[PDB]
Structure formats: C-alpha cells, structure tokens
Amino acid sequence: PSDEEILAKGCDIRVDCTTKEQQFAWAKAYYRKYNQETDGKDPKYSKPSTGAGVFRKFKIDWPNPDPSIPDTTDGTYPIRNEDFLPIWKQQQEDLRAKMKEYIGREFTEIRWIGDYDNARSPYKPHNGYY
Amino acid sequence: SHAVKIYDTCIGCTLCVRACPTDVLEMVPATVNAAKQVASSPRVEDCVGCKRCETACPTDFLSIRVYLQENEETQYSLGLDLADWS
Amino acid sequence: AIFRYVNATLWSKAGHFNKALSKGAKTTTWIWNLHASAHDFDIQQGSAGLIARKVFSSGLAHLSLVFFWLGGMHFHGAYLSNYSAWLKDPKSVAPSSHIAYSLVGQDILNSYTSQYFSGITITSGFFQLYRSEGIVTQSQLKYACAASLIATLICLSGSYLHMQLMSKFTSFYKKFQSLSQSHLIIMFGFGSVSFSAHQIHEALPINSLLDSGIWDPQLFSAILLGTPSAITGKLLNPSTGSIFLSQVAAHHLAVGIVFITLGLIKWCNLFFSRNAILSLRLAYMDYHAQLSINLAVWASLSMVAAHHLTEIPVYPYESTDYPTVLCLFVHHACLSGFFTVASGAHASIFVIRQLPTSEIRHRDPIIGHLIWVCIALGLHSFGLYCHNDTLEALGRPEDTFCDNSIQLKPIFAKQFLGLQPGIEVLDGKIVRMTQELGTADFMVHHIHAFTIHVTLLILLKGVLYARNSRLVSDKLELGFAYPCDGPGRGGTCQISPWDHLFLAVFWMYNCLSVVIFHYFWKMQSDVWGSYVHHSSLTCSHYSQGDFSVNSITINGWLRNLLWSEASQVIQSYALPSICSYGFIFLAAHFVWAFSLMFLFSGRAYWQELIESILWSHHKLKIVPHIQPRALSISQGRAVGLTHYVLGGIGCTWAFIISRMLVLTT
Amino acid sequence: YIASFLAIASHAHAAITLVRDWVAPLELESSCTIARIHTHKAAIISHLSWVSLWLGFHTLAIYSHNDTNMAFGSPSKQILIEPTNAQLIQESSGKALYSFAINSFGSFIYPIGPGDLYVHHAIALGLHVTVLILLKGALEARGSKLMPDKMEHSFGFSCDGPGRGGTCDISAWDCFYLAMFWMLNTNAWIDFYFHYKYLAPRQFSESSTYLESWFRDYLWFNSAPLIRAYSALGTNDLSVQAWFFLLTHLAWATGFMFLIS
Amino acid sequence: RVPGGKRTKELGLVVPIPEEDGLTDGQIAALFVVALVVLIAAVDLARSLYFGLQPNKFKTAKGKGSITPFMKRLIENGF
Amino acid sequence: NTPEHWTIKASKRLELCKDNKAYKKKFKDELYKTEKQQKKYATGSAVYARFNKKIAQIKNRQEAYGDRLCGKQDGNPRVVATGEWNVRASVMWPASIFLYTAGWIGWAGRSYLIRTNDETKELNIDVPLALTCMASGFSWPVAAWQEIVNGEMAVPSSQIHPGGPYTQS
Ligand code: CLA
Ligand code: CLA
Ligand SMILES: CC1=C(C#C/C(C)=C/C=C/C(C)=C/C=C/C=C(C)/C=C/C=C(C)/C=C/[C@@]23O[C@]2(C)C[C@@H](O)CC3(C)C)C(C)(C)C[C@H](O)C1
Ligand SMILES: CC1=C(/C=C/C(C)=C/C=C/C(C)=C\C=C\C=C(C)\C=C\C=C(C)\C=C\C2=C(C)CCCC2(C)C)C(C)(C)CCC1
Ligand SMILES: CC1=C(C/C=C(\C)CCC[C@H](C)CCC[C@H](C)CCCC(C)C)C(=O)c2ccccc2C1=O
C-alpha cells in the first residue's frame, strides 16, 4: 500500500510476515524513510580550482598575480596571441607565393624513398632534379 | 657481556688475537698442539661481539666461539660512546 | 705502442684482472665476485698507468656503444618507420619506428599508426628531433646512420689503440687545466657555434618550408624571416606550437660565444678567486672525485632537461605529442635520480680511498640538522595529507587543507615569463597552458622537498661516516663494500657506504615515483586536453581537472590516479595496441614482489637449504666441484634492490604509457 | 587466518622443543622418532624443495601461458587441465548423498573447473613451501652444516657474523620469520580464491585461468566502492573501512623499513 | 544511514534502530558492579602472578602446611 | 555408474568444441575483431596480407580445435590428464616426450660431471667430452635403470655429509 501503513503494521517473520516479498517491501519502505542517497556535502568542495579557468575566485595568488592566468572567472580560457594567427597565415602564404614564383613551376611532393638528381650535376638527368 | 670460549682444537696461529679489535684475547703457553700455545680470553668484559676472531679462525669448525648475550649487555660490549654507565 | 702483448690467451683465464680470483672457481661466489669486480680497475692487477689506460679506453668503448645505438635508431627511422607519413601529417599519424614479429600471435602488438604501416608507437621524440634537424628524406636518415656506424668503428679503434698507446709515462689525463680549457672552448663553445651554423644553413629553410606546406625537392636541396619582435618563448610557432628554430639557432650562437668568452677570460686569468677553490682543486684530483662531481652535474642537467623539454617547447609538434613529452620528462627525471645516487656512491669511494675535506670534521652537526629538517619536513608535509584524509573521512571538509577550506597559498611561486593572458592551442590540443598553483601544489612540492632531503641525508651520512664513526672506528680498514662489522655492539648491519647507497637508491626511487605521479596527474588535469569553442574556449582536460580537488588526500591519489587511470593498462589485454603494456604491468608487479625475497631474507637460510639440496646430488653422484654457495650478503642486497627498482619502474612505465597512448588514440 | 596462525605456531613450538627440550641420544643411536627424522632430515628437505619447485614452476608457467595467450586474444590457446580427480571424488560424494536422499547440501559441492585446479595447485605450493621453511628450521635448530653448534645458542639470535660467507637469518626463529611471510601468502591465496568464487562464480569459472583475471576482475574492479567511500562528493558508511584500508597499507609499508634497512 | 554497499543499495537492506535503549541505568550499574568485582580480583591475580611462589613461607607463616588426601593419592600414583 | 563413464569423453561438464555454442561464439568474436582491425589498413598493404594470414591461422585453429573437448559454460578446449592416451589433447604424449628429454639432459650432465671430476673442467668445458656425453645420453632410461639395479647410481648415505650435528659428541 503505502510506506506509512507498511511501517505502522511492521514486519515479523515469526508471526505474519512469512512472505519474503512482504519482508523486503517493508525493508524498502524503511530504507526510503530512514536512508539518504548522499551525506549532503557542500558541492563547492567538488569543483576544480586550478586548470578550470576559475583560479581567480580563490585569490590564491593575489599579491602580484600572474598575468598569463585569465582574470575572468567564467571558466573559459582565451587563446594567447590570437592576433598573430592571421598574420602568420598571411606570412606563410606570401612565402609560398614567393617561392612558387621563384621556381616557376608547381610544387611537387617529395618522395620519401625517391631519388633525385642534383640540379648542378654534370651528367644527363635520370630522375628530374625536382 | 658476551662469552668467548676457546677449545683444544686451537692450533695457536694467533689470528684471532691479531683480529681482536678491543684486545680481548692473548696467546698462552700450552702443550696440546705443535705450536705450543693456545689463545685465551681473559678480558671477555671488553668483547663487543663482532666475531672477527671467529672469521679469522682457520680450523674446520671454530676453535674460538663467541656466544652473544643480549640480556647482559654492558657499555663495553655495546661500545657506548656518547653515554657513560660507569 | 707495442701491440704484440695483446693476445687472446687471457680471454679464457676469466679472472686474470683480480688477484683475489687466482684460486679459480672453488665456489659460485667466485663467479659472482668476478662479475662484481670486473670493472673495478683500481683494485685490479697493474699500476696507475694501467688504471688510466683502462678508464680512458673503456670510456671510448662506451662511446662506440652509444654511437652504435644511435645508428640503430637512425636505421630504424629510415627503413622500419612511418616517418614519411608522420612528416606530411604529424597529428593524424603517431610516431612508430618499431615493428614486431608475428611469431606466436605477437603481430597483435603492432597497432594502426597509418594506412600502410602497423607497428609500435615510439615515445622517444626521435621523429620530432629529425624534423628539427631538417631530416626529411630516407637518404638523409640513411647517411646519418652511416655516420653513426662510422663513429662507432672509430671509437672502437680508438679504445683498442689507446689500450697500448698510453704507457706508464702517459700523463695527458692529469692535465686538468688543458682538459677543462679544451672542453670549454672547443667541445662546448665551438660545438654550439657550429650547431648554430648547421641550424641556420640547413634546418631553418627546411623547417620554414615544412611550416608553409612546401615539399619540393629543389627547395629542400634570409634568417629571421618569419620571427616577429616578440620575445622568444612569448610567441610559439602558430603552425607548429614550438619556439622558433631561428631563435634556437641564435641561442646556440650566443651560448657558444659566451662559452668561448669564459674560456678566454680563464686563459687570460681574469677570474681571480682561485684560492677559494684551491682546496678543492688539490683534494679532488681523483678518479672517483671527478666521477662523483660529473655524475651530480649530469643528474642536475638531466632534471633541468626533464623540466624544460616539456615546459619550454622547442621541438616541432612534441608539445602536442603527449606520450613523447611525458616519456621524455619521466626518463630524464629517472636518470637524474640515478646519477645523483651515483654521485653519492663515488663521493663515498673517494672518501674511502683518499683524504676527505675538512667539512667532515664537524659531520655530527651537519647530519644532525639534516636529520631534524628531514623529520620536520616529512612530519608537516605528509601529515597535512594525513590530516586531510582523517578529517574528510570524519566528514569535516571545512577542517582540511584545501583551496575551499584552510588554504596554504604558495606566495613565493611567482611568474617570471610575463606571458600574455590565455593559452596556446594547435589542432584541437593545448600545446601550452599556465600551471596554476594552489594548496595541492604547495603540499606536493613540500613532499618533493622532504623526499629529496631524506635521500640527501642517506647519501651524506654514507659519505661523511665512511672512514669511521662512534660505532666502528676502523671502517676505513673495513673498506667500501662490506656487509657489516658483526653482530656486536648491538649489531653493525649496513654500516658501509655501499649499504648507504643501497638505501639511498630506494629513497631516490620513492622520490622519483612521487615526482612522476605529480607531473603526470597535474599535466593531465590542468594542462593537457582538448578545447571547445576574441574567442573563449572551455578546456576539457584528460583527467578533468581533478588534481586540485582530489590530490589533497592520499585516498584521492590512490583512487583518481592509480585506480582510476589504471583502467587503460589493466583493461589492455584485448586491445592490439597496449596488450604488451598490460602484460608488462603484470610482469613488473611480479618482479617487484620477487625482489622482496632477497630484500627480506638472509644468507644462512639459503646456504643451509642449498646444502640440504646438495645432499641428494651427492647421493646420486652428481658432485658439482664448483661448490654451490648462497649469494653473499651484499650481492643479495644488490639483487633485491635491482629487482625492486626495475619492477616499480616497469609498473609505472606501462601504466603511464598505456594511459597516454589510449587517451591520445 | 586463525587456523594458519595456529599451524605455524605448532611448527614454531616444535622447533623450540627441539632446541631446548628434546634429549637427543648419541649420534649413532637411532631409537626415537625425532632421532630417526634427524638421520634423514637432508632427504626430507631436498624432497620438499623438489615438490615446491615443481609446483611453483608449473603453476606459474601455466598461468603465464594463459596470460600471454589471453593478452594476444586467443582463449582457445590456453592450457586448461580438467580437475578429473577432484571431479571424481565430488561425483562419488554426490552419489552417496543422492543415495541418502532417496533412502539439500549447499556449497558442499561446487562446479570445480580448471581455474579451481590451478588455484588448488597454487595453494598446495604455498602449503608445501611453508612446511619446507618450518621443517628446515626445526631440523636445523639443534645443528647445521653452516652452524654445527646451534644448540648452545638461544632459539632466536641475530646472526653468527660476516665470516663463513655471512650468516644472516641463521636461527630457527629466523626460519619462523621467513615462514610467516609464506603463511600470509598462502592464506591470502586461499582467501582470494574463496572471495572471488563467492562474489562471481560464473566469472571466476570462465576467467580464473589466467592471472590478469585475478588482477582486473577481482581486485581492480571490486576496489571501487571502498576507495569511493569518502571523497570530495561526500562520505558513506564505508568511510571507516576506507580509512583503515589506507592505514593498513601504510603499516605494511612501514614494516618494509624494518625488514629492509 | 548513507549506505555505501552495492548490495545494500540494491536490496534495500536496513539497519533498524529501536525506539528505546535496550538496557536501563540500573542494569548498566549492576553490570558495572560485577565488572568492578572482576577488576579487583584481576588486580589481585596480577599481583600474585608478578610475585610468584614464596618458598620462605614455611619459616614464618602460620600453620604447618597441608596436602589434600587426593593430592597425596595422586603423588603416590605418580605420573 | 558404469565402466564406460570412466573415460573423460563421457562427462556431463564437457562437450565437443565443434558442437559448443560458447566455443563457436568466442571464435566468431576473435575473427570479427581481427577483420575489424584489418579493415583499417589499405587493401593492397603488406599489413593487409599479414592480417589475411592471421585470419587463415584463426580459421585453421578453429577447425583443428573443433575435435577437442571443452566446457559447456565457457567453451575453451581442455587438456585431458586422466592418463588416456587415445584422446585428443592428451597430456601423456607431451609428458612422455618431456620426461625423455629431461632425463636425457640430466643423464648427460651427470655423466660429464662423473667423467671430469674437476672444478677446472667444470669452469672450462671440455667441449669434445661434453658433446660426447650429450650424444650418449639418448639411452638414458636403460642406462639409468641398469645403474640403479647394479648399485652404481646411489652411494650409501654414510659416504656423504648427513648435515649438522643434532647431539653431543
Ligand atoms: C624483444 C624486445 C624488445 C626489443 C628488442 C626492443 C627494442 C627497442 N625498443 Mg622497445 N619495446 C618492447 C620490447 C622490445 N623493444 C615492448 C614489449 C614494448 C611495449 C609495447 C616496447 C615499447 C617501445 C617503445 C614505446 C619504444 C621502444 C623503443 C625501442 C628501441 C629502444 C632502444 C633500447 O632498447 O635501448 C635500451 C633500453 C633499455 C634496456 C631500457 C631499460 C630500462 C627500461 C626503460 C625500464 C622500463 C621497464 C621495463 C621495460 C620492464 C620491467 C619489467 C619486466 C622485467 C617484466 C629499440 C629498437 C624506442 C624507440 O625509439 O624505438 C625505435 C621507443 O620509443 N620500445
Ligand atoms: C610508508 C612507509 C615508510 C615510513 C612511514 C617511513 C618513515 C620514515 N623513514 Mg623510511 N623507509 C621505508 C619506508 C617508510 N619510511 C622503507 C621501505 C625503507 C627501506 C628502503 C626505508 C628506509 C629508510 C631510511 C634508511 C631512512 C628512512 C627515514 C625515515 C624517516 C623520515 C623522517 C621522518 O620521520 O619524517 C616523516 C615521518 C613520517 C611521515 C611518519 C608518520 C608521521 C605521521 C603522519 C604523524 C603521526 C601522528 C601521530 C603523532 C601518531 C600517534 C599514534 C599513537 C597515538 C598510537 C621516517 C621515520 C630516514 C630517517 O630516519 O631520517 C631521520 C632514514 O634515514 N627510511
Ligand atoms: C557495626 C556494628 C553494629 C551495627 C550495626 C548496624 C545496625 C548496621 C546497619 C547497617 C545497614 C543497615 C547497612 C545497609 C547496607 C546496604 C547496602 C550495602 C545495600 C546495597 C545495595 C546495592 C549496592 C544495590 C545496588 C543495585 O542493585 C540495585 C539496588 C539496583 C540495580 O539496578 C543495580 C544496583 C547496583 C544499582 C552492631 C552489630 C550493632 C554492633 C557491632 O559491635 C558493631
Ligand atoms: C599416470 C598418470 C598420473 C599419475 C602419476 C603418478 C601418481 C606418478 C607417480 C610417480 C612416482 C611416485 C614416482 C616415484 C619416484 C621415486 C624415485 C625414488 C625416483 C628417483 C629418481 C632418480 C634417482 C633419478 C635419477 C636420474 C635419472 C634417471 C635421469 C636424470 C638424472 C637423475 C640422476 C636425476 C597423473 C594423474 C599424474 C597424470 C596422468 C597419468
Ligand atoms: C633467494 C636467495 C638466495 C638464493 C638464491 C640463489 C642462489 C640465486 C640462484 C642463482 C641462479 C643459479 C642464477 C641463474 C639465473 C636464473 C635461474 C634465471 C631464471 C630466469 C627465468 C626467466 C627462467 C640467496 O642466496 C640470498 C642471499 C642473501 C640474501 C638473500 C638471498 C635470497 O633471497
């Protein structure tokens, strides 16, 4: 029926509760009434402090704080030197174009096991020197 | 203190006496062996129990035996330096 | 110069070097002593000239051995590796120059590294080293292997020749001023300048082309081209996640110039405080003194290498190759510990064989204060962990030492790089991230200090009380490696410097295991991992940042680090990649347990058991005339120590490598 | 555990009896059981050593064969010796019990498999080695080839010096010290066997033939609740068990200090 | 209770607790009185064990000693 | 209840592997794992050929082991140790061959020791004599039984050290 009346009636194997199903039903009612899933410890002790982007909350290194650690406590880390990535891409593309023009032909993938003649060799090419 | 005993198998080579670190042993005249001398242990009170005599004994089994007695430890047998029981 | 005296007649004598082995093979202790004293050239028959001959020739032979090992590494990279696939796409393909046979189903060990290659993933960083050096072709790797083999042959020839070129008059090895000047100016200064030249002329163009994406043979066969004004180390290669190789080349040029300048000022005698070191100069002109000093120097340099190879990224893609960086750090830390205990050992040997310095005459205060600092450090540092455990178990987190509770802030741990805010990422991985220090870091660092101080205590006690002590006054007569002086004076077990090392090795291993665990867990929780999207990224770390919350308790270390992260190695049997690592985990556990046999038992039990066993052999007429003997006391200690350290190191090795391999793939 | 302690106790007190109670006759006289045993103590010890070596070699080797084959992923390659003798004895007992019933017994008969056979041979190894150490101590207590005059010295003495090659752990008390480790090992093996077969009968039957099953399915797998007892999330009724798990680990590690240094 | 056992959580095993303590203060006091008698007797026994036998008693102690007839019969029988 | 049941074949806890569902499932799973591992690499790869070889090895192993007995629950082949020679996976054949080989090794060795009787020969092996003894050790069963019978194998215990003295001399 319900836990209240189950516990009010109680369980006794000697007299009426000769049924294992009834016995464990009463046991489950008592468990639900008197047992707790967790001790209720404060959730704060489970949250990370270092590496989660929330280091500034604890004020561990307040005197002369480390600049590299983000000041925001939201838990997100910005990418260091974001501004350079477009610049780096532009530099590498410019160098690629410069070398392409200097050579005068499309870049050819090198062969790991391949053999290439030296550009200055005095003998007729066997495999293209490029 | 420990008990240093000498048995007639002794041949009087003096190696035990020479190996003694605190001069517990001494050779004494005897007629039992050809060397005409046997090691003795008069100063057993100074024996520390290092069994260097036993190490240096040549005989098949030792003609000198050091029996350790931990219950009767004295400062001389313990080699006490920082503390004095005298 | 006279090579008619080198004959193979002595090869079959097996003990000619030691006079104590003249009565050849009366027992098995003779075999063990032969092996133990094989390389103790000081106590061997001959003269000081012969000792110097052997020392130098053996150094050259070991040089040849190392060159052979390096040549083998190069050959494996060239012919038995996926270096081509790794170079074109390092991220997708894990480094592997290691292939196993298919003997007994052993082909399962080989794991998927590339489409056309299956093998064992290497963790030595050799691929990154080749990429930094500019080696991008099988021909280049093959010629590197050929050079290494030629160097091996040259060193072998040099050892063989110097065994006879150097005579009793030879004294070039005693010219310490000449030796140091030559090493400082040529070996270090000119070497660094020449390597800077190599980088500038070969590696810089090749590495720049590789970063761009160019793989053209003509290009593969203008400094500071891409490096901005940003301080070196403050800006990593966006496409490689490592310090610019041009900055590295400039570093090597500057270091070579500085070394040359130091050598030249020493040559001109500009350094003036010679007297402050004259006492050491007179005292430590000994083989063992120099060996100890050099071992300590190289141990410290190995530890600095372990730290810097990870914290400061200089090799291409090694930052994101998490197994590589971890293995490099752990390997070099272990070498640091081993060479430090070696320095202690040979300091003790020098004290035994030569006159010690005058700081040994107030040794009692030194070791007494070291004992006190060790006790206080251990008490406080480890009892903070024990306090955390007890209070947390009782249910009082507010009473524990942690960031949320009572917190021990590392006030002195201050930044010096001055980096910009944020982290550096490269293709779904965190190449660089600031490590944030708190109560857990405070506690673990003081644990480190405690263990270091106890190891130092053992080594220093062995060194200072080597000649004599209050207990035994003739330890100098006893020597260096003796088991005891006897059961007397209460018992004089392990009073020798050899036994002091035998214990300092245990303590060094304990220290290094704690250091390895700290580095591993901290990196997994707070540095390594992936990121999920001025842009702000939420960083998902491999261990989920649990170091700062769980490392405050020994139970947290046991659960979140050993048990939780042993899932990979413990459940590695079915997996083709790491089944070998699981088996090695099990076997290392076995070996470590087997070491306790020798570490706990004693000689006499085994000697009596051997005699009882030999009764039956004699009964059946099996009479071994090399009479069986139980291992000596010192040998039993050595065997136990070796097996103990090997088993522990193997367990840690397999555990960490399995975890890293699975997580990264 | 109590039974193992009492067994090793009986052995230790037999050794003490020999040391300070038995009145040995003259050497050539052989009239009492103890003297007759002392006549061929060497044969006894050699045969016990042979049995221990055989058991250890073959148990460990079969376990390692199964380990390697399972690691490579081929259970079919495992050596699985059916326990035919034990199964026959069990079948005879079951026949007798069934006849009695025709004229329930729970846990008196269990499935018994090759894993049971291997574990039983391991436990036999443990018992044989423990008895080896204890018998050697008892029969060498009065005298030994290394220390002929061991009667004069007490039951437990430190050593006999670094001479004669070194004489660590030369006393009958030192043999007991050594046999204590074995008792603990063999008892740990017995308890692990019982606990594993009790917790997971089916998994034990299928997987107990190789040691990785013991290391993974028994220790690592079942260690979760204990270590999770108390943590940053909270505590439960097993927190005391988790603190005594670690306290005892620390006590063991401390014992290592006195044993090694 | 906050159970930590897998089987306990699965099967709902409980640690029932009574409404009233089993024993009363008077009962505990009686048990403590018996325990105090045990303690006094045990201290006396420890003193006797510490001091052992006293063979000097025949010099000063009252009486002339006595052996029970059954003890005499056992002595005559022997071992 | 019958002499026929003495054979391990007629047991209720074992079944032929070719008819064992657990055995079939285990092998099917091994084959699936191997094929899945193979699929990762390219078709014409040397690793692909090696995986084909491994799959063939697994199939031949299954066919060979189908005849052996294995438990119903786990379906892993079992080794018969009753002493029945004419049974698959019998322990007697390996036992007999190993015993012969081990006796060969022991006999050879004992014979070298008897012939040499010198620590110098023990250290520096007399390779000719050692090889001669190794070759001669093939008749070790007959030779050993003959020596045991004729008294050339064991020496009386009075000729060897008995052990430590347990009494007063
Ligand atoms: C036959 C066995 C064998 C052989 C011949 C080699 C050979 C080699 N391996 Mg190794 N390796 C093996 C087994 C083997 N491995 C196994 C089973 C694994 C696990 C999958 C690995 C994993 C592995 C990796 C990941 C790497 C190598 C590498 C190498 C090279 C290193 C040079 C060297 O060994 O210097 C000599 C070095 C030593 C003698 C080390 C001694 C001390 C070690 C580090 C202690 C660690 C624990 C130990 C392994 C186990 C202890 C317990 C055990 C007794 C039960 C060389 C080709 C490296 C390389 O660059 O290859 C090209 C590399 O990166 N190996
Ligand atoms: C866990 C195992 C363990 C433990 C606890 C210790 C403990 C110690 N070892 Mg080590 N040691 C070990 C294993 C261990 N060892 C092993 C296996 C070996 C063999 C290789 C050695 C070999 C060895 C040597 C050779 C030396 C040491 C030293 C020390 C001491 C270091 C200094 C100190 O005491 O600070 C820390 C002390 C502790 C952490 C002990 C626990 C303290 C707790 C946390 C607080 C106590 C609370 C409370 C008061 C308890 C009351 C209980 C009571 C009411 C019932 C310390 C006693 C050195 C020494 O003595 O230097 C002075 C030394 O020389 N050990
Ligand atoms: C001395 C003297 C004389 C005298 C006298 C006289 C008249 C003396 C009278 C003395 C008198 C009237 C003495 C009563 C004591 C009562 C006691 C000790 C009761 C204890 C009761 C106890 C300890 C019970 C305890 C409990 O069980 C209870 C009840 C409840 C249980 O839950 C458990 C406990 C343990 C709690 C003479 C004869 C006139 C002349 C002579 O010359 C000298
Ligand atoms: C059938 C069967 C069975 C059973 C078995 C048995 C039970 C057996 C027994 C056995 C026995 C019970 C034996 C005995 C023995 C004795 C003796 C006494 C011996 C001796 C020896 C010797 C003397 C040797 C010598 C030699 C040789 C010959 C060679 C090598 C070298 C040497 C020198 C070592 C089983 C179930 C298991 C399995 C199946 C089958
Ligand atoms: C076991 C033991 C012995 C007895 C051990 C001995 C005699 C060692 C045996 C040496 C053998 C013969 C060397 C050959 C190597 C192994 C047999 C190799 C096995 C390899 C496997 C993989 C098969 C001691 O003598 C001893 C002495 C002092 C302290 C502790 C101990 C100690 O623990």
Q: Which of D124, D125, D127, D118 is nearest to D62 (CA)?
A: D118
* Contact call for F and D: 3+ CB–CB distances under 8 Å: yes
What are residue C539's DSSP bridge partners?
Answer: C531
Please give the angle made by the CA atoms of C538, C542 and C543, to the nearest 5 degrees. Answer: 105
| Whole-angstrom distance, CA of residue C260 vs CA of residue C189 | 5
DSSP C223-283: TTSS--SSPTTTS--TTT-S--HHHHHHHHHHHHHHHHHHHHHHHTT-----HHHHHHHHH
DSSP reduced 3-state for C468: coil
Between CA A81 and CA A69 the distance in angstroms is 14
Cβ neighbour number for residue C257 with a 10 Å cutoff: 14
Q: What letter does residue C401 receive in the DSSP assignment?
A: B
Q: Write b or e for each residue in C30-51: b if 16 or more Cβ atoms lie within 10 A of its Cβ, otherwise e.
A: bbbbbebbeeebeebeeeeebe
State whether E4 and D234 contact (CB < 8 Å): no
B38, B27 in Cβ contact below 8 A? yes
DSSP assignment, residue C630?
A: P
Pocket of ligand 3, candidates E33, E34, E36, E37: which has the most ligand atoms within 8 Å of its Cβ, to mutate? Answer: E33
Q: How far is CA F48 from CA C105, C118, C283, F42, in A?
A: 15, 10, 66, 7
Contact call for D232 and A40, based on CB within 8 A: no
Our answer on whether B and E touch (3+ beta-carbon pairs < 8 Å) is no
Number of other CB atoms surrounding residue A27 within 10 Å: 17
Q: How far apart are the first and last CA of chain C?
A: 59
How many angstroms separate the CA atoms of C487 and B47, rounded?
Answer: 12
Task: Count Cβ atoms within 10 A of the Cβ of residue D233 and give its class: 0-12 exposed, 13-18 middle, 19 or more buried.
Answer: middle
- β-partners of residue C538 are C532
Cα-based angle C296, C297, C301 (whole degrees, multiple of 5): 115
Ramachandran region, residue E15 (left: φ > 0; alpha: ψ -120 to 50; beta: rest) = beta
Q: Produce one character per residue of D193-213: b if its CB has 16 or more CB atoms within 10 Å, e if not.
A: beebbeebeeebbbbbbbbbb
What is the Cα–Cα distance from C335 to C342, expressed in whole angstroms? 10
A36: chain E residues, CB-CB within 8 Å? 1-2
Interface test with D, best of B7, B61, B64, B68 (most D CBs within 10 A): B68
- Nearest-angstrom CA–CA distance, F140 and F100: 8
Name the residue type at position A51.
Answer: G
Q: How far apart are CA F55 and CA F32, in angstroms?
A: 10
Residue D227: which H helix or E strand, with range?
Answer: helix D224-228
- DSSP assignments along chain F, one per residue: --GGGGSTTS-TTEEEGGG-HHHHHHHHHHHHHHHHHHHTS-TT-HHHHHHHHHHHHHHHHHHHHTTSEEETTT--B-BB-SS-SSSTTBSHHHHHHHHHHHHHHHHHHHHHHHHH--HHHHHS--HHHHHHHHHHGGGHHHHHHHHHHHT-S---GGGS---S--S--
Neighbours of A80 (CB within 10 A): 22
DSSP per position, A43-91: GGGGS--SSSS-GGGGTTT-SS--TTS-S--SS-EEBTTTTHHHHHHHH
Please give the distance, rounded to the nearest whole angstrom, from the Cα atom of residue E19 to the centre of ligand 5: 65
Is the Cβ–Cβ distance between C420 and C448 less than 8 Å? no
Take residue F113 and report the two structure tokens written for it: 């020791």
Quick check: helix, strand or coil at residue E8? helix
Strand partners, D230: none
Count CA within 13 A, CB hemisphere, residue D159: 30
**Residue B66 backbone dihedrals phi, psi, to 5 degrees:** -110, 115
DSSP string, C95-106: P--B----SSSG
Distance from C-alpha of A33 to C-alpha of A29, rounded to nearest angstrom: 6
C-alpha F166/C-alpha D27 separation (Å) is 8
Do D233 and A41 count as a contact with CB atoms less than 8 A apart?
Answer: yes
**What chain A residue is nearest to C550 in terms of C-alpha separation?**
A46
Q: How far is CA C601 from the centre of its chain?
A: 30
CA distance F138 to F140: 5
Q: Cα–Cα distance between C516 and A78 in angstroms, integer?
A: 29
E strand residue ranges, C110-176: 111-112, 118-119
User: DSSP strand E in C434-576: where?
Assistant: 530-532, 536-540
Distance CA B52, CA F71 (A): 65
- The C-alpha atoms of residue C130 and residue C136 are separated, in whole angstroms, by 7
Q: Which of D163, D174, D165 is nearest to D141 (CA)?
A: D174
Number of residues in chain D = 261
The answer to whether the beta carbons of residues B2 and B22 sit under 8 Å apart is no
Q: How far apart are CA D172 and CA D153, in angstroms?
A: 10
Selection from C481, C496, C501 nearest residue C340 by Cα: C501
Q: To the nearest whole angstrom, how far is the Cα of E21 from the nearest Cα of chain A?
A: 18
A36 with E2: Cβ contact below 8 A: yes
Of the listed ligands, the closest to the CA of C387 is 2
CA distance D15 to D9: 10
Angstrom distance (rounded) from CA B48 to CA A122: 90
CB-CB under 8 Å, D153 with B51? no
Cα(C438)–Cα(C402) distance, rounded to whole angstroms? 8
Residues of A in contact with D234 (CB under 8 A): 38-41
Q: Which chain E residues touch A30 with a CB distance below 8 Å? A: 12, 14, 16
Q: Is C424 helix (H, G, I), strand (E, B) or coil?
A: strand
Beta bridge partners of C532: C538
Q: Judging by DSSP bridges, how do beta strands C536-540 and B64-67 pair with one another? A: unpaired
Q: How far apart are CA E1 and CA C314, in angstroms?
A: 56
Crossing angle of helices C322-353 and C497-526, in 10° steps, is: 160
Distance separating alpha carbons of residues D81 and D75, to the nearest angstrom: 14
What does the angle CA B52 – CA B56 – CA B61 come to, to the nearest 5 degrees?
A: 110
Of F96, F65, F8, F99, whose CA–CA distance to D83 is shortest?
Answer: F8
Longest dimension (CA), chain C: 88
CB C583 within 8 A of CB C657: no
- Cβ atoms C588, C651 nearer than 8 A: yes
Tokens of F66: 């189908």
Q: Point out which residues pair with C112 in neighbouring strands.
A: C118
Q: Using alpha carbons only, what angle is made at residue F76 by residues F73 and F81, rounded to the nearest 5 degrees?
A: 105
Q: Residue C633 — φ and ψ, nearest 5°? A: -65, -50
Place of tokens 């520390």: B48
Residue C402 and residue D246: Cα distance in Å, rounded? 20
Q: How many whole angstroms separate alpha carbon F123 and alpha carbon C14?
A: 9
Amino acid at D241: Q
Instruction: Report angle CA C443, C448, C449 to the nearest 5 degrees.
Output: 95
CA distance D89 to C104: 38
If DSSP states are collapsed to H, E and C, what string results for C345-373? HHHHHHHHHCCCCHHHHHHHHHHHHHHHH
* Secondary structure letter of residue C41 according to DSSP: G
* Tokens standing for residue C225: 């081209």
Q: Which atom of ligand 3 is nearest to the CA of E27?
A: 32
Closest CA to A55 of C356, C135, C246, C526: C526
**Is the CB of residue C546 less than 8 Å from the CB of residue A48?**
yes
**Which conformational region is residue B61 in: left (phi greater than 0), alpha (psi within -120 to 50 degrees), or beta?**
beta
Interhelix angle for C363-394 vs C439-464, to 10°? 150
Report how far residue D135's alpha carbon sits from residue D141's, in angstroms, rounded to the nearest whole number: 10
CB C212 within 8 Å of CB A95: yes
| Burial tier of C292 (Cβ tally within 10 Å: 0-12, 13-18, 19+) | buried
- In the reported structure, the alpha carbon of residue C377 is separated from the centroid of ligand 2 by a whole-number distance in angstroms of 11
Q: Is the dihedral of CA C435, C436, C437, C440 positive or negative?
A: negative
Q: In what order do the strands lie in the sheet with C536-540?
A: A77-78, C536-540, C530-532
- Pocket probe for ligand 5: among C28, C598, C639, the residue whose CB has the most ligand atoms within 8 Å is C598
Name the DSSP class of D232: S
Q: How far apart are CA C180 and CA C172, in angstroms?
A: 12
